Paper text:
[name] (also called ENDO2) is a 34.5 kDa glycoprotein (the predicted mass for protein component alone is 30.5 kDa), encoded by the [name] At1g68290 gene. [name] follows the standard glycosylation pattern of plant S1/P1 endonucleases, with three glycosylation sites (Asn91, Asn110, and Asn184). While the P1 nuclease has a higher specificity for RNA over ssDNA, in a previous study we showed that the opposite is true for [name]. Structurally, Zn2+-dependent endonucleases present a unique fold, and are classified into the P1/S1 nuclease family (pfam ID PF02265), itself part of the Phospholipase C (PLC)/P1 nuclease superfamily (pfam ID CL0368).
We improved the resolution of our earlier sulfate co-crystal from 1.76 Å to 1.22 Å, thus yielding more insight into the glycan structure. The glycan bound to Asn91 is especially well defined and we can discern both N-acetylglucosamines (GlcNAc), and a further six mannose moieties (Man). Further, the methyl group of GlcNAc1 is located within a small aliphatic pocket formed by Leu57, and Ala88. GlcNAc2, on the other hand, interacts via π-ring stacking with Trp53. While we were able to refine only one additional mannose moiety on the glycan bound to Asn184, we obtained a much more detailed structure for the one attached to Asn110. Interestingly, GlcNAc1 at Asn110 interacts specifically with a single sulfate molecule, which itself interacts with Arg46 and Arg50, and with the aromatic nitrogen of Trp43. The sulfate binding pocket seems well prepared to bind ligands which are both negatively charged and contain de-localized π-orbitals. It is tempting to think that this might be a possible accessory binding site for ssDNA. Pocket two is occupied in the sulfate co-crystal structure by sulfate, suggesting that it should be possible for the ssDNA backbone to be bound in a similar fashion. In the SO4 co-crystal structure, however, only Wat3 remains.
Author numbering: 1 to 100, 107 to 201, 203 to 263
The structure:
Amino acid sequence: WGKEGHEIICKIAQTRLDETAAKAVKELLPESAEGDLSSLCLWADRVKFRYHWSSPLHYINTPDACSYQYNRDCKDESGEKGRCVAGAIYNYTTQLLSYKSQYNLTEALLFVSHFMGDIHQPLHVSYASDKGGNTIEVHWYTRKANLHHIWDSNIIETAEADLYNSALEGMVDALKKNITTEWADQVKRWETCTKTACPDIYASEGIQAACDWAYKGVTEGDTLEDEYFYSRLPIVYQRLAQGGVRLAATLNRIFG
Ligand SMILES: *[C@@H]1O[C@H](CO)[C@@H](O[C@@H]2O[C@H](CO)[C@@H](O[C@@H]3O[C@H](CO[C@H]4O[C@H](CO[C@H]5O[C@H](CO)[C@@H](O)[C@H](O)[C@@H]5O)[C@@H](O)[C@H](O[C@H]5O[C@H](CO)[C@@H](O)[C@H](O)[C@@H]5O)[C@@H]4O)[C@@H](O)[C@H](O[C@H]4O[C@H](CO)[C@@H](O)[C@H](O)[C@@H]4O[C@H]4O[C@H](CO)[C@@H](O)[C@H](O)[C@@H]4O)[C@@H]3O)[C@H](O)[C@H]2NC(C)=O)[C@H](O)[C@H]1NC(C)=O
Ligand SMILES: *[C@@H]1O[C@H](CO)[C@@H](O[C@@H]2O[C@H](CO)[C@@H](O[C@@H]3O[C@H](CO)[C@@H](O)[C@H](O[C@H]4O[C@H](CO)[C@@H](O)[C@H](O)[C@@H]4O)[C@@H]3O)[C@H](O)[C@H]2NC(C)=O)[C@H](O[C@@H]2O[C@@H](C)[C@@H](O)[C@@H](O)[C@@H]2O)[C@H]1NC(C)=O
Ligand SMILES: *[C@@H]1O[C@H](CO)[C@@H](O[C@@H]2O[C@H](CO)[C@@H](O[C@@H]3O[C@H](CO)[C@@H](O)[C@H](O)[C@@H]3O)[C@H](O)[C@H]2NC(C)=O)[C@H](O)[C@H]1NC(C)=O
Ligand SMILES: [Zn+2]
Ligand SMILES: [Zn+2]
Ligand SMILES: [Zn+2]
């Protein structure tokens, strides 16, 4: 996701922390964050080149199909197993279990927070052949955009402006209300993990969404506008809510 998606996920998550996780997060964040996890939930994107080994950790490349399997797909372009967003979530969650080494656990917190978000963006678990939709060039209303960017940013930005009247917290607040009043039974399933982290579950949902919602109906050169926007917005909402709920549930397990 772009900035807005990560902020939403991290705002939802931080308000769902239990006392032990809330305490650990306050302790691990730098002073400059002013206690707010969401102020640093794009940090991982800002070290893609300084930590160039981290760049493949934001996504999963799959074959042209609707399936994900860790052993088949969780690898970087050189074939190194584990080097994908699912593998990164396992790595950094494991590191945080040691909290109160060799590792910087502030970085581990910021990585797991960002990557729990990215594994929920459908086009972060999608086809190698189109670079997760980056090579699918369309228009978003009147402007050129690639499909990946539409999912990272344009849908959310257009909703924030047109539907939420530029209210920086309107979408968050509406998602939180629905977590309580519309989605309670589902939320319980979203939180449950028979392990500490369950990223493969989330990735498998994501490639299915990439097939059925993101790529579906889209051809190079199309104009995506209201029909696509209104029909895909509920799945964006779902994935943001899932990401926030699962980030909190995972941190609660780690720090508990
Ligand atoms: C899980 O989370 C962890 C933590 O975030 C991730 O760890 C990171 O993993 C990446 C690789 O995936 C590492 O980067 C690579 O590091 C090696 C060198 O590794 C040694 O040096 C590291 C840096 O040390 C200096 O800096 C520190 C900090 O300032 C100082 O303290 C030191 O004194 C040094 O000055 C050091 O971090 C490494 O230690 C880690 O590993 C050891 C085990 O060996 C542990 O004991 C430690 O506790 C610690 O965990 C280690 O000592 C580089 O060689 C890599 O770069 C080369 O290769 C790249 C291609 O693969 C290429 O792009 C680069 O240009 C570079 O290429 C050059 O060198 C090659 C080899 O010689 C040549 O072939 C090539 O031609 C060219 O010349 C790369 O930088 C991170 O260091 C590591 N970070 C940490 C903190 O551990 C992990 O990836 C995560 N995994 C998943 C799945 O999420
Ligand atoms: C665990 O990991 C985090 C994230 O990587 C580290 O936090 C980062 O620390 C660095 C400093 O090491 C901060 O950058 C500095 O920010 C200040 C203020 O903007 C700059 O003045 C400073 O610039 C100087 O140093 C650079 C060194 O390369 C030079 O390029 C410049 O020219 C200039 O001389 C530098 O940019 C990051 O902002 C900060 N990131 C975050 C997200 O907080 C942890 O480092 C610790 O915490 C820091 C706040 C600071 O107190 C460090 O001294 C601490 O080590 C790191 N924890 C570790 C290693 O224990
Ligand atoms: C929070 O949950 C509420 C309730 O589900 C969401 O509002 C509902 O949004 C749906 C669209 O996802 C609306 O349904 C649509 O209505 C039109 C017109 O009838 C129809 O063409 C579509 O086929 C679809 O049925 C629904 O009217 C609306 N409900 C209410 C009471 O306003 C809301 O969007 C959710 N917000 C977030 C952030 O999740
Ligand atoms: Zn992202
Ligand atoms: Zn992206
Ligand atoms: Zn990212």
